[PDB]
Amino acid sequence: DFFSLAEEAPIIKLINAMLGEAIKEGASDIHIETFEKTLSIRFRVDGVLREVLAPSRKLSSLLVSRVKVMAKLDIAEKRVPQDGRISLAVDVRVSTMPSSHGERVVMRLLDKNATRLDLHSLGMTAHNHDNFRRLIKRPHGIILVTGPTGSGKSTTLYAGLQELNSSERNILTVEDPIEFDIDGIGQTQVNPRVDMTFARGLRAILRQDPDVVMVGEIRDLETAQIAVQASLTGHLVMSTLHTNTAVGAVTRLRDMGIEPFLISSSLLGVLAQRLVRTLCPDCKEPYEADKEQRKLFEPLILYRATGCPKCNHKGYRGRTGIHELLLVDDALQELIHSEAGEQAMEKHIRATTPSIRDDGLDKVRQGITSLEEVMRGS
Ligand SMILES: [Cl-]
Numbered sequence: 001d002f003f004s005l006a007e008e009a010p011i012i013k014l015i016n017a018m019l020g021e022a023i024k025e026g027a028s029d030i031h032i033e034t035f036e037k038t039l040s041i042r043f044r045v046d047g048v049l050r051e052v053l054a055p056s057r058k059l060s061s062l063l064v065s066r067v068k069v070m071a072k073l074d075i076a077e078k079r080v081p082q083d084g085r086i087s088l089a090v091d092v093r094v095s096t097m098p099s100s101h102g103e104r105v106v107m108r109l110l111d112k113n114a115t116r117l118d119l120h121s122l123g124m125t126a127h128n129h130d131n132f133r134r135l136i137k138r139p140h141g142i143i144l145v146t147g148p149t150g151s152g153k154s155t156t157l158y159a160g161l162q163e164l165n166s167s168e169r170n171i172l173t174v175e176d177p178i179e180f181d182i183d184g185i186g187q188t189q190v191n192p193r194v195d196m197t198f199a200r201g202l203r204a205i206l207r208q209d210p211d212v213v214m215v216g217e218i219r220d221l222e223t224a225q226i227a228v229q230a231s232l233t234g235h236l237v238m239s240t241l242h243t244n245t246a247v248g249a250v251t252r253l254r255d256m257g258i259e260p261f262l263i264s265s266s267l268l269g270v271l272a273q274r275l276v277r278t279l280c281p282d283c284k285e286p287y288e289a290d291k292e293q294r295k296l297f298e299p300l301i302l303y304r305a306t307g308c309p310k311c312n313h314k315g316y317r318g319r320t321g322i323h324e325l326l327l328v329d330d331a332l333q334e335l336i337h338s339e340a341g342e343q344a345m346e347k348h349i350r351a352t353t354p355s356i357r358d359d360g361l362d363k364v365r366q367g368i369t370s371l372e373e374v375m376r377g378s
């Protein structure tokens with residue numbers, strides 16, 4: 001019990017008890033901060049921030065170090081931001097930050113399970129959903145899920161793999177690290193301790209007679225090269241890159257050193273993805289689009305954020321994907337092979353497929369999210 005212990009390493013035991021009390025209360029965040037004359041611990045539960053303890057300023061340097069080791073961070077470093085992860089099942093993100101009386105730390109505490117969705121719960125529109133299900137059922141080629149960090153690329157990969165997880169396929173994975181176990185799917189973790197890297201593991205994966213193979217991310221030329229070869233020898237391969245557009249995936253493959261022709265004969269599709277917060281149904285306010293907002297699309301009724309208790313910070317509860325699914329055809333292969341560039345590839349793709357903005361803009365029309373939340377990402 002955190003509170004009993006507070007009355008009294010015991011620092012390891014305090015920190016763990018605090019984490020335990022935080023989950024027990026349903027708290028989303030823990031803050032440890034140093035003030036000149038005192039130290040402070042705050043918890044946020046359901047948006048509400050509060051001071052749960054104010055122990056001696058002298059403990060500060062120690063609570064900061066303790067959290068640092070747990071998240072695998074530099075105790076010697078004090079002048080710059082640091083971020084790491086712990087899994088305890090609870091995904092805790094830890095952020096330390098230089099501050100005039102000492103590094104402030106925050107522990108973000110997420111439910112690992114709410115992140116686990118099925119393929120029809122990602123917010124794909126009917127078309128994208130239909131086409132993505134046909135893409136993942138193909139015998140061979142590369143399917144890439146792309147977007148910046150926090151796009152939820154891990155979730156969609158997992159949803160897709162799960163859609164395929166039948167005893168008629170052999171689905172193997174290499175991950176850094178494994179997010180959770182799927183069951184039916186052989187999952188492998190990159191372990192630096194034995195030079196077990198994305199490249200080595202994926203190489204071994206191919207001697208395991210797989211039908212489908214997942215790579216956590218393609219980071220280097222070598223992992224890309226093996227991925228391209230896997231996909232050209234009869235395997236369906238799925239991965240991520242953190243590019244900002246669908247067509248931008250082609251470019252990054254090229255810039256890394258993959259032969260333009262080999263990108264053009266291996267790539268099946270690129271699912272570019274973003275997360276937008278879904279407006280709180282309770283306090284979401286209708287309004288009538290002014291002339292400048294109509295330019296972006298009778299009275300057009302959209303919705304605005306505001307804020308209530310069911311949301312907290314802002315009028316949003318939960319989030320949902322918006323996508324642009326790039327599908328390789330004959331004419332796109334020519335454009336990839338000939339290195340025509342992003343502008344020519346997009347222009348080709350627009351005949352059949354809307355941009356992410358338009359997909360987001362469609363959801364705004366539906367009143368699922370705000371115009372701000374879609375535009376701010378573009
Ligand atoms: Cl992601």
Ligand SMILES: [Zn+2]
Pocket residue numbers: 280281282283284307308309310311312315316
């Ligand atoms: Zn609300």
